[PDB]
Tab-separated table of C-alpha atoms in Angstrom:
chain	number	residue	atom	x	y	z
V	5	UNK	CA	-16.969	-4.205	13.240
V	6	UNK	CA	-14.858	-4.666	16.622
V	7	UNK	CA	-13.682	-7.820	15.337
V	8	UNK	CA	-12.763	-7.281	11.764
V	9	UNK	CA	-10.965	-3.707	12.863
V	10	UNK	CA	-8.658	-5.692	15.386
V	11	UNK	CA	-7.283	-8.465	12.902
V	12	UNK	CA	-7.427	-5.506	10.103
V	13	UNK	CA	-5.071	-3.505	12.630
V	14	UNK	CA	-2.605	-7.416	13.885
V	15	UNK	CA	-2.300	-7.301	9.342
V	16	UNK	CA	-1.230	-3.797	10.314
V	17	UNK	CA	1.011	-4.255	13.251
V	18	UNK	CA	2.654	-7.696	11.517
V	19	UNK	CA	3.601	-5.255	8.599
V	20	UNK	CA	4.651	-1.732	10.477
V	21	UNK	CA	1.581	-0.217	9.222
V	22	UNK	CA	0.944	1.554	11.804
V	23	UNK	CA	-0.844	4.523	11.104
V	24	UNK	CA	-3.246	1.648	9.563
V	25	UNK	CA	-3.251	0.389	13.435
V	26	UNK	CA	-3.522	3.517	14.803
V	27	UNK	CA	-6.868	4.370	12.030
V	28	UNK	CA	-7.763	0.677	13.302
V	29	UNK	CA	-8.230	0.876	17.006
V	30	UNK	CA	-9.342	5.106	17.129
V	31	UNK	CA	-12.688	3.912	15.300
V	32	UNK	CA	-12.950	0.828	17.744
V	33	UNK	CA	-12.923	2.573	20.584
V	34	UNK	CA	-15.288	4.912	18.957
V	35	UNK	CA	-17.912	2.263	19.443
V	36	UNK	CA	-17.681	3.128	22.853
V	37	UNK	CA	-17.326	0.375	24.059
V	38	UNK	CA	-14.037	-0.925	27.092
V	39	UNK	CA	-11.091	-2.258	25.108
V	40	UNK	CA	-9.892	-5.679	25.689
V	41	UNK	CA	-6.909	-5.825	27.334
V	42	UNK	CA	-5.628	-7.228	23.653
V	43	UNK	CA	-7.060	-3.697	21.905
V	44	UNK	CA	-5.434	-1.710	24.541
V	45	UNK	CA	-2.248	-3.225	23.712
V	46	UNK	CA	-2.412	-2.891	20.306
V	47	UNK	CA	-4.281	0.786	20.826
V	48	UNK	CA	-0.751	1.789	22.169
V	49	UNK	CA	1.664	-0.054	20.833
V	50	UNK	CA	-0.001	2.088	16.940
V	51	UNK	CA	0.088	4.841	18.559
V	52	UNK	CA	3.525	5.019	20.368
V	53	UNK	CA	4.900	3.839	16.928
V	54	UNK	CA	3.087	6.655	15.294
V	55	UNK	CA	4.060	9.901	17.604
V	56	UNK	CA	7.410	7.506	18.307
V	57	UNK	CA	8.590	8.439	14.795
V	58	UNK	CA	7.710	12.305	14.804
V	59	UNK	CA	9.545	12.672	18.344
V	60	UNK	CA	12.515	10.671	17.072
V	61	UNK	CA	12.838	12.762	13.333
V	62	UNK	CA	12.115	16.258	16.174
V	63	UNK	CA	15.572	15.803	17.847
V	64	UNK	CA	17.340	14.812	15.038
V	65	UNK	CA	15.874	18.406	12.929
V	66	UNK	CA	16.875	20.398	16.581
V	67	UNK	CA	19.631	19.783	17.028
V	68	UNK	CA	20.603	20.045	12.965
V	69	UNK	CA	18.661	23.371	13.226
V	70	UNK	CA	20.936	24.080	16.426
V	71	UNK	CA	23.692	23.000	15.349
V	72	UNK	CA	24.200	25.634	12.546
V	75	UNK	CA	23.851	29.715	7.618
V	76	UNK	CA	20.586	31.919	7.319
V	77	UNK	CA	19.609	29.871	4.666
V	78	UNK	CA	20.379	26.835	7.026
V	79	UNK	CA	17.999	28.246	9.559
V	80	UNK	CA	15.123	28.429	7.311
V	81	UNK	CA	15.175	25.263	6.065
V	82	UNK	CA	15.088	23.554	9.521
V	83	UNK	CA	12.853	25.463	11.462
V	84	UNK	CA	9.609	25.383	8.407
V	85	UNK	CA	10.617	21.355	8.453
V	86	UNK	CA	11.015	20.877	12.552
V	87	UNK	CA	7.103	23.495	12.533
V	88	UNK	CA	5.951	19.994	10.186
V	89	UNK	CA	7.144	17.259	11.717
V	90	UNK	CA	6.254	19.397	14.921
V	91	UNK	CA	2.164	19.639	13.673
V	92	UNK	CA	1.997	16.096	12.718
V	93	UNK	CA	3.098	15.391	15.830
V	94	UNK	CA	0.510	17.563	18.134
V	95	UNK	CA	-2.061	16.172	15.806
V	96	UNK	CA	-0.956	12.538	17.048
V	97	UNK	CA	-1.391	13.319	20.531
V	98	UNK	CA	-4.497	15.312	20.267
V	99	UNK	CA	-5.855	11.905	18.814
V	100	UNK	CA	-5.278	10.640	22.071
V	101	UNK	CA	-5.708	12.753	24.742
V	102	UNK	CA	-9.217	13.081	22.356
V	103	UNK	CA	-9.512	8.985	22.457
V	104	UNK	CA	-8.940	9.187	27.098
V	105	UNK	CA	-10.890	11.811	27.631
V	106	UNK	CA	-14.284	10.902	26.377
V	107	UNK	CA	-13.522	6.255	25.805
V	108	UNK	CA	-10.873	5.840	27.375
V	109	UNK	CA	-10.711	7.225	31.194
V	110	UNK	CA	-14.376	7.341	31.842
V	111	UNK	CA	-14.599	3.624	30.092
V	112	UNK	CA	-12.063	2.216	33.238
V	113	UNK	CA	-14.127	-0.208	34.875
V	114	UNK	CA	-10.745	-1.357	37.113
V	115	UNK	CA	-8.285	0.279	38.604
V	116	UNK	CA	-5.406	-1.494	36.392
V	117	UNK	CA	-6.844	-0.055	32.409
V	118	UNK	CA	-7.481	3.678	34.599
V	119	UNK	CA	-3.999	3.910	35.634
V	120	UNK	CA	-3.396	2.662	32.301
V	121	UNK	CA	-4.924	4.902	30.576
V	122	UNK	CA	-4.390	7.765	33.251
V	123	UNK	CA	-0.332	7.024	32.460
V	124	UNK	CA	-1.326	7.655	28.804
V	125	UNK	CA	-2.126	11.172	29.268
V	126	UNK	CA	0.276	11.823	31.693
V	127	UNK	CA	2.291	10.712	28.358
V	128	UNK	CA	0.794	12.412	25.897
V	129	UNK	CA	0.717	15.233	27.528
V	130	UNK	CA	4.278	15.088	28.190
V	131	UNK	CA	4.977	14.348	24.480
V	132	UNK	CA	3.997	17.724	24.343
V	133	UNK	CA	5.029	19.252	26.628
V	134	UNK	CA	8.746	18.499	24.310
V	135	UNK	CA	7.394	20.378	21.919
V	136	UNK	CA	5.205	23.108	23.611
V	137	UNK	CA	6.866	26.873	24.352
V	138	UNK	CA	5.390	30.331	24.933
V	139	UNK	CA	2.455	30.775	26.986
V	140	UNK	CA	1.203	26.809	26.462
V	141	UNK	CA	4.812	25.119	27.945
V	142	UNK	CA	2.598	26.262	31.510
V	143	UNK	CA	-1.070	25.028	31.335
V	144	UNK	CA	0.769	21.618	29.229
V	145	UNK	CA	3.053	20.731	32.243
V	146	UNK	CA	0.331	21.126	34.474
V	147	UNK	CA	-1.880	18.499	32.137
V	148	UNK	CA	0.678	16.062	32.091
V	149	UNK	CA	2.021	16.116	36.188
V	150	UNK	CA	-1.715	16.179	36.909
V	151	UNK	CA	-3.207	13.211	34.492
V	152	UNK	CA	0.338	10.998	36.684
V	153	UNK	CA	-0.077	12.614	40.260
V	154	UNK	CA	-3.935	10.904	39.447
V	155	UNK	CA	-2.864	7.609	38.464
V	156	UNK	CA	-0.016	7.631	40.976
V	157	UNK	CA	-2.246	7.395	44.061
V	158	UNK	CA	-4.766	5.267	42.749
V	159	UNK	CA	-1.921	2.905	41.977
V	160	UNK	CA	-0.331	3.401	45.593
V	161	UNK	CA	-3.718	1.668	46.446
V	162	UNK	CA	-3.991	-0.728	44.283
V	163	UNK	CA	-0.848	-2.182	43.309
V	164	UNK	CA	1.619	-4.428	44.094
V	165	UNK	CA	5.375	-2.785	44.730
V	166	UNK	CA	6.353	-5.177	41.623
V	167	UNK	CA	3.292	-4.429	39.659
V	168	UNK	CA	4.926	-3.927	36.242
V	169	UNK	CA	2.087	-0.649	35.667
V	170	UNK	CA	2.931	1.026	39.018
V	171	UNK	CA	6.536	0.117	38.289
V	172	UNK	CA	5.909	1.355	33.963
V	173	UNK	CA	4.802	4.549	35.989
V	174	UNK	CA	7.435	5.408	38.041
V	175	UNK	CA	9.041	5.538	35.039
V	176	UNK	CA	7.605	7.872	33.409
V	177	UNK	CA	6.686	9.943	36.140
V	178	UNK	CA	9.891	10.049	37.046
V	179	UNK	CA	11.180	10.309	33.215
V	180	UNK	CA	8.128	13.728	33.522
V	181	UNK	CA	10.005	15.004	36.265
V	182	UNK	CA	13.744	14.610	34.976
V	183	UNK	CA	13.764	16.044	31.709
V	184	UNK	CA	9.939	17.769	31.526
V	185	UNK	CA	10.157	19.518	35.213
V	186	UNK	CA	14.099	19.188	35.800
V	187	UNK	CA	14.140	18.725	38.773
V	188	UNK	CA	16.383	15.542	39.576
V	189	UNK	CA	16.343	15.369	43.203
V	190	UNK	CA	12.259	14.573	43.232
V	191	UNK	CA	12.368	12.625	40.084
V	192	UNK	CA	15.682	10.014	41.446
V	193	UNK	CA	14.088	9.526	44.803
V	194	UNK	CA	10.687	8.789	42.857
V	195	UNK	CA	11.943	5.992	40.915
V	196	UNK	CA	14.697	5.060	43.753
V	197	UNK	CA	11.303	4.612	45.996
V	198	UNK	CA	9.662	2.446	43.694
V	199	UNK	CA	13.160	-0.280	42.789
V	200	UNK	CA	13.837	0.279	46.633
V	201	UNK	CA	9.899	-0.547	47.505
V	202	UNK	CA	9.485	-3.599	44.644
V	203	UNK	CA	13.116	-5.247	46.292
V	204	UNK	CA	11.425	-5.103	49.217
V	205	UNK	CA	8.388	-6.903	48.283
V	206	UNK	CA	9.708	-9.243	45.572
V	207	UNK	CA	7.760	-12.772	47.052
V	208	UNK	CA	5.466	-10.746	46.304
V	209	UNK	CA	6.959	-11.143	41.834
V	210	UNK	CA	4.514	-14.080	40.279
V	211	UNK	CA	5.892	-15.302	37.508
V	212	UNK	CA	3.738	-14.034	35.048
V	213	UNK	CA	4.790	-10.362	35.404
V	214	UNK	CA	8.766	-11.276	36.225
V	215	UNK	CA	9.647	-10.696	32.799
V	216	UNK	CA	8.361	-7.611	32.799
V	217	UNK	CA	9.070	-6.205	35.465
V	218	UNK	CA	13.254	-6.989	35.830
V	219	UNK	CA	13.409	-5.097	32.747
V	220	UNK	CA	11.702	-1.902	33.742
V	221	UNK	CA	13.781	-3.141	37.866
V	222	UNK	CA	16.787	-2.077	35.217
V	223	UNK	CA	15.751	0.329	33.518
V	224	UNK	CA	14.398	2.277	36.961
V	225	UNK	CA	18.050	1.369	38.191
V	226	UNK	CA	19.797	2.746	34.224
V	227	UNK	CA	18.197	6.128	34.591
V	228	UNK	CA	19.205	6.164	38.151
V	229	UNK	CA	22.842	5.542	38.199
V	230	UNK	CA	22.452	7.909	35.006
V	231	UNK	CA	21.155	11.498	37.248
V	232	UNK	CA	23.290	10.223	39.926
V	233	UNK	CA	26.268	10.780	38.024
V	234	UNK	CA	27.474	7.994	37.775
V	235	UNK	CA	25.349	6.950	40.515
V	236	UNK	CA	28.185	5.956	43.161
V	237	UNK	CA	29.595	2.902	41.501
V	238	UNK	CA	32.883	1.197	42.533
V	239	UNK	CA	33.704	-2.800	41.439
V	240	UNK	CA	31.510	-5.174	43.054
V	241	UNK	CA	31.414	-9.093	43.583
V	242	UNK	CA	29.317	-11.706	45.638
V	243	UNK	CA	31.261	-10.177	48.063
V	244	UNK	CA	28.284	-6.730	48.071
V	245	UNK	CA	26.685	-7.550	50.951
V	246	UNK	CA	27.913	-8.293	54.862
D	5	UNK	CA	14.695	25.891	-5.762
D	6	UNK	CA	17.340	22.998	-6.938
D	7	UNK	CA	19.219	23.662	-3.930
D	8	UNK	CA	17.346	24.535	-1.345
D	9	UNK	CA	14.889	20.814	-2.213
D	10	UNK	CA	18.697	19.094	-1.848
D	11	UNK	CA	19.232	20.172	1.803
D	12	UNK	CA	15.343	19.360	2.581
D	13	UNK	CA	16.320	15.732	1.512
D	14	UNK	CA	19.112	15.623	3.229
D	15	UNK	CA	16.917	17.099	6.339
D	16	UNK	CA	14.346	14.415	5.970
D	17	UNK	CA	16.843	11.500	5.004
D	18	UNK	CA	19.017	12.407	8.883
D	19	UNK	CA	15.576	12.055	10.502
D	20	UNK	CA	14.357	9.267	8.504
D	21	UNK	CA	10.931	10.551	6.197
D	22	UNK	CA	11.984	8.915	2.757
D	23	UNK	CA	8.589	10.110	1.616
D	24	UNK	CA	9.877	13.605	1.791
D	25	UNK	CA	12.607	12.561	0.730
D	26	UNK	CA	11.083	10.858	-2.309
D	27	UNK	CA	9.646	14.096	-2.877
D	28	UNK	CA	12.108	17.200	-2.736
D	29	UNK	CA	14.246	14.660	-5.606
D	30	UNK	CA	11.699	14.466	-7.497
D	31	UNK	CA	11.012	17.811	-7.815
D	32	UNK	CA	14.626	18.443	-8.148
D	33	UNK	CA	14.375	15.840	-11.474
D	34	UNK	CA	11.320	17.761	-12.914
D	35	UNK	CA	13.609	20.952	-13.173
D	36	UNK	CA	14.811	18.795	-16.457
D	37	UNK	CA	18.808	19.323	-15.273
D	38	UNK	CA	20.938	16.263	-15.046
D	39	UNK	CA	21.562	15.451	-11.613
D	40	UNK	CA	24.572	15.907	-10.223
D	41	UNK	CA	26.325	12.217	-8.155
D	42	UNK	CA	25.240	13.439	-5.025
D	43	UNK	CA	22.012	14.260	-6.101
D	44	UNK	CA	20.651	10.415	-8.890
D	45	UNK	CA	22.048	8.649	-4.876
D	46	UNK	CA	19.992	11.202	-3.025
D	47	UNK	CA	16.797	10.524	-5.259
D	48	UNK	CA	17.579	6.920	-5.201
D	49	UNK	CA	18.135	5.993	-1.983
D	50	UNK	CA	14.899	8.114	-0.862
D	51	UNK	CA	12.480	5.869	-3.434
D	52	UNK	CA	13.832	2.607	-2.865
D	53	UNK	CA	13.592	2.999	1.010
D	54	UNK	CA	9.878	4.397	-0.682
D	55	UNK	CA	9.584	0.930	-2.341
D	56	UNK	CA	11.407	-1.657	0.061
D	57	UNK	CA	8.620	-0.599	2.298
D	58	UNK	CA	5.578	-1.905	0.768
D	59	UNK	CA	7.496	-4.221	-0.469
D	60	UNK	CA	8.454	-5.820	1.931
D	61	UNK	CA	4.868	-5.065	3.628
D	62	UNK	CA	3.082	-6.839	0.675
D	63	UNK	CA	5.281	-10.266	1.430
D	64	UNK	CA	4.552	-10.115	4.858
D	65	UNK	CA	0.151	-9.919	4.423
D	66	UNK	CA	0.783	-12.625	1.192
D	67	UNK	CA	2.992	-15.425	3.711
D	68	UNK	CA	-0.253	-14.258	5.984
D	69	UNK	CA	-2.941	-14.269	3.195
D	70	UNK	CA	-0.924	-17.529	2.503
D	71	UNK	CA	-0.804	-19.019	5.788
D	72	UNK	CA	-4.449	-19.240	6.781
D	75	UNK	CA	-10.449	-19.068	7.271
D	76	UNK	CA	-12.995	-16.460	4.371
D	77	UNK	CA	-13.652	-14.253	7.362
D	78	UNK	CA	-9.267	-14.174	6.984
D	79	UNK	CA	-8.918	-13.980	3.485
D	80	UNK	CA	-11.558	-11.426	2.767
D	81	UNK	CA	-9.663	-8.899	4.906
D	82	UNK	CA	-5.805	-10.417	3.823
D	83	UNK	CA	-6.752	-10.050	0.488
D	84	UNK	CA	-8.583	-6.031	0.706
D	85	UNK	CA	-5.309	-5.054	2.605
D	86	UNK	CA	-2.748	-6.504	0.388
D	87	UNK	CA	-4.662	-4.912	-2.739
D	88	UNK	CA	-3.852	-1.094	-1.329
D	89	UNK	CA	-0.516	-2.362	-0.366
D	90	UNK	CA	-0.226	-3.562	-4.358
D	91	UNK	CA	-1.839	-0.233	-5.357
D	92	UNK	CA	0.224	1.721	-3.008
D	93	UNK	CA	3.817	0.191	-4.429
D	94	UNK	CA	2.289	0.457	-8.458
D	95	UNK	CA	1.556	3.970	-7.586
D	96	UNK	CA	5.815	4.059	-6.343
D	97	UNK	CA	6.821	2.380	-9.544
D	98	UNK	CA	5.440	4.278	-12.134
D	99	UNK	CA	6.581	6.672	-10.660
D	100	UNK	CA	9.751	6.373	-10.494
D	101	UNK	CA	9.823	4.494	-14.500
D	102	UNK	CA	7.689	7.452	-15.571
D	103	UNK	CA	11.052	10.150	-13.839
D	104	UNK	CA	13.365	7.442	-15.778
D	105	UNK	CA	11.245	7.465	-19.196
D	106	UNK	CA	10.932	11.691	-19.404
D	107	UNK	CA	13.800	12.635	-17.716
D	108	UNK	CA	16.441	11.174	-16.178
D	109	UNK	CA	17.037	8.635	-19.192
D	110	UNK	CA	16.986	10.619	-22.249
D	111	UNK	CA	19.654	13.391	-20.146
D	112	UNK	CA	21.938	10.823	-19.069
D	113	UNK	CA	25.007	12.299	-20.828
D	114	UNK	CA	27.658	9.507	-19.788
D	115	UNK	CA	27.656	5.617	-19.920
D	116	UNK	CA	28.374	5.328	-16.442
D	117	UNK	CA	24.879	7.623	-15.391
D	118	UNK	CA	22.924	5.521	-18.464
D	119	UNK	CA	23.771	2.959	-17.036
D	120	UNK	CA	22.212	3.381	-13.562
D	121	UNK	CA	19.123	4.699	-15.274
D	122	UNK	CA	18.244	1.495	-17.429
D	123	UNK	CA	19.194	-1.031	-14.530
D	124	UNK	CA	17.044	1.712	-12.659
D	125	UNK	CA	14.367	0.751	-14.822
D	126	UNK	CA	15.163	-2.530	-15.072
D	127	UNK	CA	14.578	-2.854	-11.188
D	128	UNK	CA	11.110	-0.734	-10.695
D	129	UNK	CA	10.166	-3.271	-13.954
D	130	UNK	CA	10.976	-5.911	-12.025
D	131	UNK	CA	9.269	-4.805	-8.439
D	132	UNK	CA	6.522	-4.162	-9.975
D	133	UNK	CA	6.266	-7.550	-11.591
D	134	UNK	CA	6.853	-9.122	-7.990
D	135	UNK	CA	2.773	-7.910	-7.154
D	136	UNK	CA	1.579	-8.064	-11.292
D	137	UNK	CA	-0.888	-10.672	-11.985
D	138	UNK	CA	-2.203	-12.112	-15.873
D	139	UNK	CA	-2.216	-10.349	-18.848
D	140	UNK	CA	0.610	-8.035	-17.501
D	141	UNK	CA	3.048	-9.595	-15.849
D	142	UNK	CA	4.191	-10.421	-19.747
D	143	UNK	CA	5.359	-7.430	-20.599
D	144	UNK	CA	6.352	-6.219	-17.706
D	145	UNK	CA	9.012	-8.971	-17.661
D	146	UNK	CA	9.394	-7.613	-20.682
D	147	UNK	CA	10.454	-4.559	-19.338
D	148	UNK	CA	12.036	-5.190	-16.913
D	149	UNK	CA	14.788	-7.641	-18.710
D	150	UNK	CA	14.283	-5.187	-21.697
D	151	UNK	CA	16.212	-2.085	-19.274
D	152	UNK	CA	18.853	-4.335	-17.746
D	153	UNK	CA	19.814	-5.436	-21.339
D	154	UNK	CA	19.937	-2.631	-22.038
D	155	UNK	CA	22.406	-0.971	-18.805
D	156	UNK	CA	24.174	-4.427	-19.476
D	157	UNK	CA	25.215	-4.333	-22.900
D	158	UNK	CA	26.867	-1.120	-22.289
D	159	UNK	CA	27.773	-1.427	-18.817
D	160	UNK	CA	29.927	-5.204	-21.134
D	161	UNK	CA	31.628	-2.020	-23.162
D	162	UNK	CA	31.889	0.404	-21.370
D	163	UNK	CA	33.901	-0.475	-17.283
D	164	UNK	CA	35.699	-2.676	-15.780
D	165	UNK	CA	34.769	-6.167	-14.436
D	166	UNK	CA	35.051	-5.074	-11.400
D	167	UNK	CA	33.166	-1.398	-11.780
D	168	UNK	CA	30.532	-1.515	-8.651
D	169	UNK	CA	27.684	-0.573	-11.205
D	170	UNK	CA	28.645	-2.776	-13.476
D	171	UNK	CA	28.956	-5.411	-10.745
D	172	UNK	CA	25.912	-4.079	-9.187
D	173	UNK	CA	23.745	-4.546	-12.849
D	174	UNK	CA	25.129	-8.302	-12.579
D	175	UNK	CA	23.536	-8.013	-9.438
D	176	UNK	CA	19.890	-7.558	-9.730
D	177	UNK	CA	20.434	-9.192	-13.765
D	178	UNK	CA	20.582	-12.401	-11.958
D	179	UNK	CA	18.081	-11.788	-9.560
D	180	UNK	CA	14.955	-10.980	-12.438
D	181	UNK	CA	15.886	-14.194	-14.415
D	182	UNK	CA	16.259	-15.938	-10.815
D	183	UNK	CA	13.137	-14.372	-9.364
D	184	UNK	CA	11.262	-13.495	-12.065
D	185	UNK	CA	11.593	-15.554	-14.441
D	186	UNK	CA	12.891	-18.798	-12.765
D	187	UNK	CA	15.623	-19.130	-15.237
D	188	UNK	CA	18.107	-20.607	-12.087
D	189	UNK	CA	20.394	-21.687	-15.060
D	190	UNK	CA	21.098	-18.149	-16.715
D	191	UNK	CA	20.484	-15.992	-13.318
D	192	UNK	CA	24.110	-18.274	-11.504
D	193	UNK	CA	25.603	-17.925	-14.819
D	194	UNK	CA	25.371	-14.991	-15.030
D	195	UNK	CA	25.875	-14.289	-11.528
D	196	UNK	CA	29.052	-16.807	-11.457
D	197	UNK	CA	30.695	-14.861	-15.135
D	198	UNK	CA	31.055	-11.513	-13.672
D	199	UNK	CA	32.040	-12.184	-10.431
D	200	UNK	CA	34.653	-15.189	-12.049
D	201	UNK	CA	35.850	-11.990	-14.810
D	202	UNK	CA	36.337	-8.947	-11.321
D	203	UNK	CA	38.596	-11.661	-9.674
D	204	UNK	CA	40.369	-11.915	-12.513
D	205	UNK	CA	41.592	-8.353	-12.684
D	206	UNK	CA	41.180	-7.754	-9.476
D	207	UNK	CA	44.927	-4.899	-10.214
D	208	UNK	CA	42.211	-2.897	-12.133
D	209	UNK	CA	40.650	-2.460	-9.246
D	210	UNK	CA	41.245	0.668	-7.179
D	211	UNK	CA	41.438	1.696	-3.495
D	212	UNK	CA	38.490	4.871	-4.829
D	213	UNK	CA	36.006	1.795	-5.556
D	214	UNK	CA	37.567	-2.177	-3.111
D	215	UNK	CA	35.147	-1.278	-0.254
D	216	UNK	CA	32.345	-1.300	-2.389
D	217	UNK	CA	33.549	-3.998	-5.591
D	218	UNK	CA	34.511	-6.908	-2.386
D	219	UNK	CA	31.021	-5.928	-0.644
D	220	UNK	CA	28.781	-6.640	-3.996
D	221	UNK	CA	31.766	-9.492	-4.369
D	222	UNK	CA	30.185	-11.487	-1.551
D	223	UNK	CA	26.851	-10.742	-2.574
D	224	UNK	CA	27.101	-12.473	-5.423
D	225	UNK	CA	28.956	-15.275	-4.844
D	226	UNK	CA	26.049	-15.857	-1.866
D	227	UNK	CA	23.752	-15.764	-3.631
D	228	UNK	CA	25.472	-18.417	-6.248
D	229	UNK	CA	26.200	-20.705	-3.141
D	230	UNK	CA	22.464	-20.473	-1.893
D	231	UNK	CA	20.697	-21.162	-6.206
D	232	UNK	CA	23.482	-24.164	-6.700
D	233	UNK	CA	22.304	-25.893	-3.380
D	234	UNK	CA	25.143	-26.183	-0.594
D	235	UNK	CA	27.722	-24.098	-3.293
D	236	UNK	CA	29.724	-27.717	-3.785
D	237	UNK	CA	30.857	-26.149	-0.614
D	238	UNK	CA	32.602	-28.663	1.519
D	239	UNK	CA	35.847	-26.765	4.092
D	240	UNK	CA	39.001	-24.874	3.114
D	241	UNK	CA	41.748	-23.806	4.877
D	242	UNK	CA	44.476	-21.567	2.937
D	243	UNK	CA	45.621	-24.479	1.333
D	244	UNK	CA	42.462	-24.536	-1.708
D	245	UNK	CA	45.545	-23.502	-4.335
D	246	UNK	CA	47.311	-26.566	-5.770
């Protein structure tokens, strides 16, 4: 049952068998009860590890398929298509769970934001390997989910809330990588980052560890996207 | 065919999909032709990654099953038994390939030593999780394979040969971990290590990188097995 599957998943996770962990939490979700915060995390972790495995493998084999003979074309296509199928299966599972169980059962504006972000992410993972007619609609589906989550969080969370900030991060990545719109991508991330700094007081010890990491990630992305970020060497003489 | 499967495995390996890599090389072996030195390595790598995954997972779940409730006993046993089954399947595959294809086809005393070491290893991996009646015979099968390899290498290789030294390493581990005979384990490793130093001239640039690593591993094990190894602080004043 619920408690057995969760303790099962905690074993799976400790043992780094994330496919087992995802299988556990898939079943948990399908009981139809709203996940806990522990259980939200467990599911979330499980599936990032699973899809992530496929996504890194895909990029390796794509880059090899780029970096090439016709013998070596034949092999790499047939393999990337294999990995692509695995990957889409994984994404379609999560996207299903989100549609049927997670987003409908989300009773708090936070949990809803997390699950809309998750949809946005998994549609973006599809967009990474989407081709032809399908890309159009899949990019919409990601943006549609991210934008829904974005506007909810804008109303519901403090600028320094790790979920809001994490959302801004992945949304700016969608805009940058998937949509190829850096004007938009950098403004999204910068405005979030600025707004968080403007309300550092509103940060509690509770989430000081996590908010300051996501801010560094936002800033990291930003300087990367804007060439060298306009940077020059600085001392504790920066302000006037 | 052979060349397609090998280039297939090189993709699999680059993409860290070692189950695919093992599957590739399993088929290669089963063509019935003696593997190359490239192909020996590919198979060997593929399966260490595969069994290694299971072995680390096993030890994690065993230690959790130790560190515990009866609820938590029920879950951990049923899971360790799952992993144990996976693991034995993997070992039985390799052990089969070694028996039917690799050791029979080994035409050079080196390749034979490598494949006898490999048998010794995979029987030792079984010994790690063996229980009851079976352990007896499985420990014999490991020692029988290691000893065969040992005596061949003693005649056929220089004391500084990485294969001889690597064999001494894993044999001393069998004696230590699986057999629980440290007198024997430390003498095996020390005598190998001493004998290599005694003939450092016989070391070529070809294998200088690898022989000096295995020697450090032998020595590492040795100081660990003999308490603190009799060590005190030393300077370039050590010799007389």
